[PDB]
Amino acid sequence: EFYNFYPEVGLQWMGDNYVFIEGDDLVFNKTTRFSAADLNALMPPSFRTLDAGRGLVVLFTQGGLVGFDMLARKVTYLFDTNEETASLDFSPVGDRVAYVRNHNLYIARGGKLGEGMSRAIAVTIDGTETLVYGQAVHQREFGIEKGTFWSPKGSCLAFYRMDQSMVKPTPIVDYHPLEAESKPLYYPMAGTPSHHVTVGIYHLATGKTVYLQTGEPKEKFLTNLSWSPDENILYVAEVNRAQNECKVNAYDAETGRFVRTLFVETDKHYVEPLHPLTFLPGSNNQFIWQSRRDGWNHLYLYDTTGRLIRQVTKGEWEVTNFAGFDPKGTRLYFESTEASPLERHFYCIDIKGGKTKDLTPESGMHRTQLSPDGSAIIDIFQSPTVPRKVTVTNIGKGSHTLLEAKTGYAMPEIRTGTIMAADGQTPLYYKLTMPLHFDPAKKYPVIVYVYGGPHAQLVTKTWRSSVGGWDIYMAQKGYAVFTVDSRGSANRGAAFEQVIHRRLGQTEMADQMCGVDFLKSQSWVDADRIGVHGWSYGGFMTTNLMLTHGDVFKVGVAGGPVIDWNRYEIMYGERYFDAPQENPEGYDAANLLKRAGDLKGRLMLIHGAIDPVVVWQHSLLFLDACVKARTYPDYYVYPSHEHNVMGPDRVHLYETITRYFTDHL
Amino acid sequence: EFYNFYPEVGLQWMGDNYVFIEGDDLVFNKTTRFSAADLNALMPPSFRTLDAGRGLVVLFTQGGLVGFDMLARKVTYLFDTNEETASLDFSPVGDRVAYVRNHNLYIARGGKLGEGMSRAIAVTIDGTETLVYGQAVHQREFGIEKGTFWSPKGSCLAFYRMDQSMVKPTPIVDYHPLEAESKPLYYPMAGTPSHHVTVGIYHLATGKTVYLQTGEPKEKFLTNLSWSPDENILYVAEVNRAQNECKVNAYDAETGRFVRTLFVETDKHYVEPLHPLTFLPGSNNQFIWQSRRDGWNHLYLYDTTGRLIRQVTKGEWEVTNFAGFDPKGTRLYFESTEASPLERHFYCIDIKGGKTKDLTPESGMHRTQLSPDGSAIIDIFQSPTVPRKVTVTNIGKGSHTLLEAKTGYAMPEIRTGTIMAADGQTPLYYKLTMPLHFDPAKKYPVIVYVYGGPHAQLVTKTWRSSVGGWDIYMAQKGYAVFTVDSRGSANRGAAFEQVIHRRLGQTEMADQMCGVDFLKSQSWVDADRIGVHGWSYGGFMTTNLMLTHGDVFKVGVAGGPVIDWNRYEIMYGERYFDAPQENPEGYDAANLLKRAGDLKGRLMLIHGAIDPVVVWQHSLLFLDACVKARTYPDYYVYPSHEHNVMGPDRVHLYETITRYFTDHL
């Protein structure tokens, strides 16, 4: 997932009050306070909210976790997960927590003050390096971010069982010990055998476990597990290897037996379920399902028989976040791009459909939180002219501004606009960061910062940078930085994105060159000093651009670059490129190893040695291919980092990257 | 071992004639010929000579090996080693060959034309990745280059059995397969448990195997195995972990029982046996032993009771190669530095000792081959003024010149001289490659090409370059290249070398800076543009110099650099540095990872990913240390190469290295 480093917010709901920290106190407002001392006075700070409605949180302290009720100001339970915190998943009942330790899934029960503790229960006992329990599966695709799913009333715990013994692993080497130590990473590459995932359901009352009878193919992707409100059924969105069919099936939670198929979604290119079924309040028969079936992500209302009652939201825009319903379940609240693809607004719409009502009309980026009630919202706004403006509003009533931020020196000027894609019809939005102290009478070198892969959108109406401030940093050194969201990028509908199917890099590069044509039309641009930089999909693009248009891009820096898609994962890779065996021509055209001989400019590849997203092998083989082809790239490796360089070391990364450009461009 | 790439010779003895190839024929001279057709006419080209005296060779052809008698012009035997050629060791009888395949040692018997073949015999059957048979052991130190040793009459085959199950391996990754594949390299690092080597003796007549009862410590180094001429005893030079004691022991070949200790050698710093016992012709009781015990490598005459009869050669010079004896065993023939450490001459000396007689007096580098007879010699000469001069001489009689090689353009001028070491007493020899088209009135950048590790000497009276011509290539780009053999380097006696003991890098750098003082005294040298380059020990030096004298060395390129000696091998490492636990101060001072923050110039490290000499971890951890220290080196990796980049890819290496200097220095 594309991440904007160096972000420049404790706000949230607890009961019917919005709460935020102020270093010492936790301020509740409709305006009471809770000092760290008062809290500590109840202990036998940072915390994770478990139930916003009830204001129940869990405090991470030395020697266990401490559940605490912020509204009643009382300790709930003390939990002992043997120091495990990464996989913690608390039951909705709040008195139990599931977690994974040493390959196995466990359930720990909270203990009340001075009531004694109980030993956790082992749901599984045969976990191993090739048999994973309760963890994310399918490479975290399809919205999967964990492997434990509590039933609504806490009666059962569903979990993933991933047998990856048939997956040929990649070595991940830790160079810190005296002798380096390798550990296998079961990264399933495109076209190879995938892992086998099954779903288990542990019944807490009986201690019995049953597995869903999902059948064959065993490689089928089991996604978006969703429990029925009454806990009798567990719904699963099953996706085939081709990823062009998604069947929403209901399974009997008691026996694991298949019950029925509610509906099936198909697509010419690919179907991609990303969200679970969300049942209407108080209903066990109606639920909202998100789908991009009509070319745009919208909310669909289904009954559990599989009948589509109605497509609630409609239009050439996309729902970017479903926030929930009103108490009675007659209204839907969500964030969308209706106002503009470059903006995010919070809307309300009748469950019967119709016109939407924008609740945050100010132009810019709105990130909103619906209160447990459904009566008020916390809104955090920002725009090119507005750093941030925090607002709390009683839907319908008035709005209260909690905060709103707003020199003798300078900052890089940021220009924005639109240009036509390579098809001459589709408009592309760009962001141009001007050199510091820009002089319209002078010529300047320019660097295209590119990503261009699906799921990301770098050009929005936000405050400052969207790429970790790297564009601003480069600009401070006299280099303009240009970025354009080429076709394939997100939040512009399926057509805009799927044009890249089976042909990664082709349309993307054509659109990026339209960006270059725009830059060359600028009189202040030195057409002979154009560079390019990107990470991940952007690393692939950076490299592909230098090999494909070596006369234009003189210098480039590619981080964690995908070089050979046959070596990228099955799930993400085969969705956009199909399988290697089904698309030799597309894969061959994007295989940068085959065109290393076309590198005539200066290019530095950068890689984290323990990168589990883009395996190190990608950049190493590119250098190898360059040796054979007699071309000369440069290199740098961060042995302690994974896909991206985070933390203070990112300073070293920026210095390395920028100096390469100031040295050679 | 330091290797001079891009060398700029088929000569050898066969019976009493010197032979060399001429593309088509094999010319024998006292002058007969043997065309490839005539030979092929006898087949049911390149070859390996097995017995120079009898002119027996083995031809490598598709579908087996073909033994051939060049003097009698007849096929001897056909050998089937199942395509194994790397470990081939032919019995002195010439009708059998030992080899290793799939972890086990085998003996194959040659088959005569149309006489049928016999299946090879398996000497061992339990070989594994952690149990190696018949291969070099102890990291190829102590002169060990193989693991099979035939007894003189071919009655027995002695071999190494190395149990390395207690050695913690280093992963060597092959990045070519779809998913990278790692293989453990049992590289024993300094201070850790060493492997356990034992010696087995396979008796061909009975098929029985007995192991020498070498006892404990099991880590003891078993070196220079030497068979008694009568095959009843197998001598072994045993070296302790401290490497300050070497005991020459005799073992009963029949039972493996210890018989007696002939003599023991000790040293304040280290003892290093490098050659086997060589018995006098026709004698089973007297042998020549090479030893540097008196500060210089000389030939010692011992009787098998252990009594030292006499030190045959003596003087402040070293025997660099023992060629053998005269027929009657009253004279010794050898190559030495008596004439000059910068030269190599072939000498003769009475077995009683006394004055030596130089048989190749011309100043320069003589590489000589003593005929099977001991009456004549083949001499290949070269000097700064003489490319090459091939001579064949009947010792005592006259000399015949077989070949002697000798423009409107230019070549880099090479200057040589001497400077005082940092002690102000020891003279150091240097080689200075001047910039092409050198103009004494101009200023030039200069690069110090350094190695400086033990066992190597880069400055000798040879033709052209001694460092793969890299110095000449750099000079052609306008950069002078300077090299000085600092203390620690070879062929200057033990005192000159052992000054580095327990303090690697310290004296070496001090002497290299004396070289810098010399360069700065030259008016044509731009003191602000001094660089440094080296490989292996030279990579360690290059890096250490930039960190220690960052004000002087502006740019450097370090290949396969040792960065942390705690991560270098036990055998070589502990000899010169002692164990990490015994010398914290020395190791700490040479640990470049601890001073990465001192890098203020431009430094590119280069490494072969599958390097089994200097594990990749060395340069990777240096970059890692630089990230933490906020310093910025550059990098390049050759994924398909081991310690050095050989073959056509070396062109890419030279371009990469030189461009770094032309870009930054």
Short mmCIF file of N, CA and C in Angstrom, two decimals, chain A residues 451-558:
data_model
loop_
_atom_site.label_atom_id
_atom_site.label_comp_id
_atom_site.label_asym_id
_atom_site.label_seq_id
_atom_site.Cartn_x
_atom_site.Cartn_y
_atom_site.Cartn_z
N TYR A 451 4.63 6.64 -9.64
CA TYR A 451 4.22 5.41 -8.97
C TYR A 451 3.43 4.73 -10.09
N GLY A 452 2.21 5.20 -10.31
CA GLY A 452 1.39 4.67 -11.40
C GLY A 452 0.75 3.30 -11.26
N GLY A 453 0.94 2.63 -10.13
CA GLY A 453 0.34 1.32 -9.97
C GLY A 453 -1.09 1.41 -9.45
N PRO A 454 -1.86 0.32 -9.56
CA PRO A 454 -3.25 0.34 -9.08
C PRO A 454 -3.36 0.52 -7.56
N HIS A 455 -4.53 0.98 -7.13
CA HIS A 455 -4.84 1.22 -5.72
C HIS A 455 -4.29 2.52 -5.14
N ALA A 456 -3.45 3.22 -5.89
CA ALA A 456 -2.90 4.48 -5.38
C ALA A 456 -3.23 5.68 -6.25
N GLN A 457 -3.33 6.84 -5.60
CA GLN A 457 -3.62 8.11 -6.27
C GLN A 457 -2.76 9.15 -5.54
N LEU A 458 -1.77 9.69 -6.24
CA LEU A 458 -0.84 10.65 -5.65
C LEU A 458 -1.22 12.12 -5.77
N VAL A 459 -2.17 12.43 -6.64
CA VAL A 459 -2.57 13.82 -6.84
C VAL A 459 -3.96 14.12 -6.29
N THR A 460 -4.00 14.73 -5.11
CA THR A 460 -5.27 15.10 -4.47
C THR A 460 -5.15 16.51 -3.89
N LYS A 461 -6.29 17.10 -3.52
CA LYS A 461 -6.30 18.45 -2.97
C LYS A 461 -6.00 18.41 -1.47
N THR A 462 -4.74 18.11 -1.16
CA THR A 462 -4.30 18.00 0.22
C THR A 462 -3.33 19.13 0.59
N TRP A 463 -2.82 19.08 1.81
CA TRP A 463 -1.87 20.08 2.26
C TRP A 463 -0.45 19.56 2.07
N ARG A 464 0.39 20.36 1.42
CA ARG A 464 1.78 19.99 1.17
C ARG A 464 1.94 18.75 0.29
N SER A 465 2.96 17.95 0.60
CA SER A 465 3.28 16.75 -0.17
C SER A 465 2.44 15.51 0.11
N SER A 466 2.43 14.61 -0.87
CA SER A 466 1.69 13.36 -0.80
C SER A 466 2.66 12.19 -0.97
N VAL A 467 3.94 12.52 -1.13
CA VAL A 467 4.97 11.50 -1.31
C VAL A 467 6.09 11.62 -0.27
N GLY A 468 5.70 11.75 0.99
CA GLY A 468 6.67 11.86 2.07
C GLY A 468 7.52 13.11 2.07
N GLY A 469 7.08 14.14 1.35
CA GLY A 469 7.82 15.38 1.29
C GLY A 469 9.10 15.31 0.48
N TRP A 470 9.31 14.20 -0.22
CA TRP A 470 10.52 14.06 -1.02
C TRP A 470 10.54 15.08 -2.15
N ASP A 471 9.37 15.34 -2.74
CA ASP A 471 9.25 16.31 -3.82
C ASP A 471 9.70 17.69 -3.35
N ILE A 472 9.29 18.06 -2.14
CA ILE A 472 9.66 19.35 -1.57
C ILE A 472 11.16 19.40 -1.30
N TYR A 473 11.70 18.31 -0.77
CA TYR A 473 13.12 18.26 -0.48
C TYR A 473 13.95 18.41 -1.75
N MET A 474 13.55 17.72 -2.81
CA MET A 474 14.26 17.77 -4.07
C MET A 474 14.18 19.20 -4.61
N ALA A 475 12.99 19.79 -4.53
CA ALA A 475 12.78 21.15 -5.01
C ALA A 475 13.66 22.16 -4.28
N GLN A 476 13.93 21.91 -3.00
CA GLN A 476 14.78 22.81 -2.22
C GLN A 476 16.22 22.78 -2.73
N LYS A 477 16.54 21.78 -3.54
CA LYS A 477 17.88 21.67 -4.09
C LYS A 477 17.94 22.14 -5.54
N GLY A 478 16.88 22.83 -5.97
CA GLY A 478 16.84 23.36 -7.32
C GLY A 478 16.24 22.50 -8.41
N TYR A 479 15.57 21.41 -8.05
CA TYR A 479 14.97 20.54 -9.05
C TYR A 479 13.46 20.51 -8.94
N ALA A 480 12.78 20.74 -10.06
CA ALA A 480 11.33 20.69 -10.05
C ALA A 480 10.94 19.22 -10.02
N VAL A 481 9.82 18.91 -9.38
CA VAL A 481 9.34 17.53 -9.30
C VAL A 481 7.92 17.49 -9.83
N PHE A 482 7.70 16.62 -10.81
CA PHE A 482 6.41 16.47 -11.47
C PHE A 482 5.81 15.08 -11.26
N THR A 483 4.51 15.05 -10.97
CA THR A 483 3.80 13.79 -10.78
C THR A 483 2.43 13.85 -11.44
N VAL A 484 2.10 12.81 -12.19
CA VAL A 484 0.80 12.75 -12.84
C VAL A 484 0.18 11.37 -12.59
N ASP A 485 -1.09 11.35 -12.22
CA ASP A 485 -1.79 10.09 -11.98
C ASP A 485 -2.23 9.54 -13.33
N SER A 486 -1.38 8.70 -13.91
CA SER A 486 -1.64 8.08 -15.19
C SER A 486 -2.71 7.00 -15.09
N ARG A 487 -3.25 6.58 -16.23
CA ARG A 487 -4.26 5.54 -16.22
C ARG A 487 -3.69 4.31 -15.55
N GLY A 488 -4.53 3.66 -14.75
CA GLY A 488 -4.11 2.51 -13.99
C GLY A 488 -4.23 2.92 -12.53
N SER A 489 -4.09 4.22 -12.27
CA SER A 489 -4.17 4.74 -10.91
C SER A 489 -5.61 4.66 -10.38
N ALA A 490 -5.78 4.93 -9.09
CA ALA A 490 -7.07 4.76 -8.43
C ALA A 490 -8.08 5.90 -8.32
N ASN A 491 -9.26 5.49 -7.83
CA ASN A 491 -10.39 6.37 -7.58
C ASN A 491 -10.93 7.11 -8.80
N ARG A 492 -10.75 6.51 -9.97
CA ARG A 492 -11.23 7.10 -11.22
C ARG A 492 -12.12 6.11 -11.96
N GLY A 493 -12.53 5.05 -11.27
CA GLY A 493 -13.38 4.05 -11.89
C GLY A 493 -12.60 2.89 -12.48
N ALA A 494 -13.28 1.77 -12.72
CA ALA A 494 -12.65 0.57 -13.27
C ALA A 494 -12.06 0.72 -14.68
N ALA A 495 -12.78 1.40 -15.57
CA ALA A 495 -12.30 1.57 -16.94
C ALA A 495 -10.94 2.26 -16.96
N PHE A 496 -10.82 3.33 -16.19
CA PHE A 496 -9.59 4.10 -16.07
C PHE A 496 -8.43 3.21 -15.60
N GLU A 497 -8.74 2.27 -14.72
CA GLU A 497 -7.73 1.36 -14.15
C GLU A 497 -7.42 0.12 -14.97
N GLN A 498 -8.46 -0.61 -15.36
CA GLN A 498 -8.30 -1.86 -16.08
C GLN A 498 -7.72 -1.80 -17.49
N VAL A 499 -7.45 -0.60 -17.98
CA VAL A 499 -6.86 -0.49 -19.31
C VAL A 499 -5.47 -1.15 -19.29
N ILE A 500 -4.88 -1.27 -18.10
CA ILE A 500 -3.55 -1.87 -17.97
C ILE A 500 -3.53 -3.40 -17.96
N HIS A 501 -4.69 -4.03 -17.79
CA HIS A 501 -4.79 -5.49 -17.74
C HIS A 501 -3.98 -6.21 -18.82
N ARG A 502 -3.20 -7.20 -18.40
CA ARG A 502 -2.37 -8.00 -19.30
C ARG A 502 -1.27 -7.22 -20.02
N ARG A 503 -1.10 -5.94 -19.68
CA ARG A 503 -0.08 -5.13 -20.36
C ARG A 503 0.59 -4.11 -19.43
N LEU A 504 0.98 -4.54 -18.24
CA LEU A 504 1.60 -3.63 -17.28
C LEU A 504 2.75 -2.80 -17.85
N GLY A 505 2.72 -1.50 -17.54
CA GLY A 505 3.75 -0.59 -17.99
C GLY A 505 3.49 0.16 -19.29
N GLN A 506 2.81 -0.48 -20.23
CA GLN A 506 2.55 0.13 -21.53
C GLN A 506 1.73 1.41 -21.53
N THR A 507 0.49 1.34 -21.07
CA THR A 507 -0.35 2.53 -21.03
C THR A 507 0.19 3.52 -20.02
N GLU A 508 0.69 3.00 -18.89
CA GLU A 508 1.23 3.86 -17.85
C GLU A 508 2.35 4.75 -18.40
N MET A 509 3.30 4.14 -19.10
CA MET A 509 4.41 4.90 -19.67
C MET A 509 3.94 5.91 -20.72
N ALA A 510 2.98 5.51 -21.55
CA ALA A 510 2.46 6.40 -22.58
C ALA A 510 1.88 7.64 -21.91
N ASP A 511 1.14 7.46 -20.82
CA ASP A 511 0.57 8.60 -20.12
C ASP A 511 1.65 9.43 -19.44
N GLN A 512 2.69 8.78 -18.92
CA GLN A 512 3.77 9.53 -18.27
C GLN A 512 4.50 10.39 -19.31
N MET A 513 4.60 9.90 -20.54
CA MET A 513 5.27 10.66 -21.59
C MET A 513 4.42 11.86 -22.01
N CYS A 514 3.11 11.78 -21.76
CA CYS A 514 2.25 12.92 -22.07
C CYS A 514 2.62 13.97 -21.03
N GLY A 515 3.02 13.51 -19.86
CA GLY A 515 3.43 14.42 -18.81
C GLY A 515 4.73 15.08 -19.23
N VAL A 516 5.61 14.31 -19.87
CA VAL A 516 6.89 14.83 -20.34
C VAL A 516 6.65 15.87 -21.44
N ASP A 517 5.69 15.61 -22.33
CA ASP A 517 5.38 16.56 -23.39
C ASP A 517 4.94 17.88 -22.77
N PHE A 518 4.18 17.79 -21.68
CA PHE A 518 3.73 18.99 -20.98
C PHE A 518 4.92 19.74 -20.42
N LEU A 519 5.83 19.01 -19.77
CA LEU A 519 7.00 19.64 -19.19
C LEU A 519 7.86 20.33 -20.26
N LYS A 520 8.02 19.68 -21.41
CA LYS A 520 8.83 20.25 -22.48
C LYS A 520 8.20 21.50 -23.10
N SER A 521 6.90 21.68 -22.88
CA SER A 521 6.20 22.85 -23.41
C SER A 521 6.41 24.04 -22.48
N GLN A 522 7.01 23.78 -21.32
CA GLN A 522 7.29 24.84 -20.36
C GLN A 522 8.66 25.42 -20.74
N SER A 523 8.74 26.74 -20.86
CA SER A 523 9.98 27.40 -21.25
C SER A 523 11.07 27.33 -20.18
N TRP A 524 10.67 27.19 -18.92
CA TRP A 524 11.64 27.14 -17.83
C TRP A 524 12.23 25.74 -17.60
N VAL A 525 11.71 24.76 -18.33
CA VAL A 525 12.19 23.38 -18.21
C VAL A 525 13.38 23.08 -19.12
N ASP A 526 14.45 22.56 -18.54
CA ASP A 526 15.62 22.20 -19.33
C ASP A 526 15.31 20.79 -19.83
N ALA A 527 14.90 20.70 -21.09
CA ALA A 527 14.54 19.42 -21.69
C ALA A 527 15.67 18.40 -21.71
N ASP A 528 16.90 18.84 -21.49
CA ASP A 528 18.02 17.92 -21.50
C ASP A 528 18.35 17.37 -20.12
N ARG A 529 17.67 17.88 -19.09
CA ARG A 529 17.91 17.43 -17.72
C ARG A 529 16.65 16.88 -17.04
N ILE A 530 16.03 15.89 -17.66
CA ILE A 530 14.83 15.28 -17.11
C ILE A 530 15.20 13.96 -16.41
N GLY A 531 14.74 13.79 -15.18
CA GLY A 531 15.03 12.58 -14.43
C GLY A 531 13.75 11.88 -14.01
N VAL A 532 13.88 10.76 -13.29
CA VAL A 532 12.71 10.01 -12.84
C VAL A 532 13.00 9.21 -11.56
N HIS A 533 12.03 9.18 -10.65
CA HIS A 533 12.16 8.46 -9.38
C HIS A 533 10.84 7.84 -8.93
N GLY A 534 10.93 6.66 -8.32
CA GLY A 534 9.74 5.97 -7.84
C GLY A 534 10.08 4.75 -7.00
N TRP A 535 9.10 4.24 -6.27
CA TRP A 535 9.30 3.08 -5.41
C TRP A 535 8.26 2.00 -5.71
N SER A 536 8.66 0.74 -5.59
CA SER A 536 7.77 -0.40 -5.83
C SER A 536 7.26 -0.39 -7.27
N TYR A 537 5.95 -0.21 -7.47
CA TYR A 537 5.44 -0.15 -8.84
C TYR A 537 6.15 1.05 -9.50
N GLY A 538 6.46 2.05 -8.69
CA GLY A 538 7.14 3.23 -9.19
C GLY A 538 8.59 2.93 -9.54
N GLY A 539 9.16 1.89 -8.92
CA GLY A 539 10.53 1.52 -9.21
C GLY A 539 10.54 0.81 -10.55
N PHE A 540 9.51 0.02 -10.78
CA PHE A 540 9.33 -0.69 -12.04
C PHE A 540 9.18 0.36 -13.15
N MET A 541 8.35 1.37 -12.88
CA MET A 541 8.11 2.43 -13.86
C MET A 541 9.35 3.25 -14.15
N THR A 542 10.06 3.64 -13.09
CA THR A 542 11.29 4.42 -13.21
C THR A 542 12.27 3.70 -14.14
N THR A 543 12.48 2.41 -13.88
CA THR A 543 13.40 1.60 -14.67
C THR A 543 12.90 1.39 -16.10
N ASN A 544 11.62 1.05 -16.24
CA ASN A 544 11.03 0.82 -17.55
C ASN A 544 11.14 2.08 -18.41
N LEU A 545 10.92 3.24 -17.78
CA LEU A 545 10.99 4.51 -18.49
C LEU A 545 12.40 4.82 -19.00
N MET A 546 13.41 4.52 -18.19
CA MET A 546 14.77 4.78 -18.62
C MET A 546 15.21 3.83 -19.74
N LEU A 547 14.67 2.62 -19.74
CA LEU A 547 15.01 1.64 -20.76
C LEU A 547 14.22 1.88 -22.04
N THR A 548 12.98 2.32 -21.89
CA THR A 548 12.11 2.56 -23.03
C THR A 548 12.32 3.93 -23.65
N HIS A 549 12.61 4.93 -22.82
CA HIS A 549 12.83 6.28 -23.32
C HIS A 549 14.16 6.83 -22.80
N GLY A 550 15.24 6.10 -23.09
CA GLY A 550 16.56 6.48 -22.65
C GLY A 550 17.06 7.82 -23.15
N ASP A 551 16.45 8.33 -24.22
CA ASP A 551 16.86 9.62 -24.77
C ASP A 551 16.30 10.77 -23.93
N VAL A 552 15.21 10.49 -23.23
CA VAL A 552 14.55 11.49 -22.39
C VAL A 552 15.03 11.49 -20.93
N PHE A 553 14.93 10.34 -20.26
CA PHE A 553 15.34 10.25 -18.86
C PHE A 553 16.83 9.98 -18.70
N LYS A 554 17.55 11.02 -18.31
CA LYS A 554 19.00 10.97 -18.12
C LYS A 554 19.44 10.27 -16.85
N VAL A 555 18.70 10.47 -15.77
CA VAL A 555 19.03 9.90 -14.47
C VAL A 555 17.78 9.41 -13.74
N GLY A 556 17.91 8.31 -13.02
CA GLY A 556 16.79 7.78 -12.28
C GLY A 556 17.21 7.04 -11.03
N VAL A 557 16.29 6.93 -10.08
CA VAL A 557 16.53 6.20 -8.84
C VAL A 557 15.28 5.36 -8.64
N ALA A 558 15.46 4.04 -8.62
CA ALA A 558 14.34 3.12 -8.45
C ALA A 558 14.47 2.31 -7.17
#
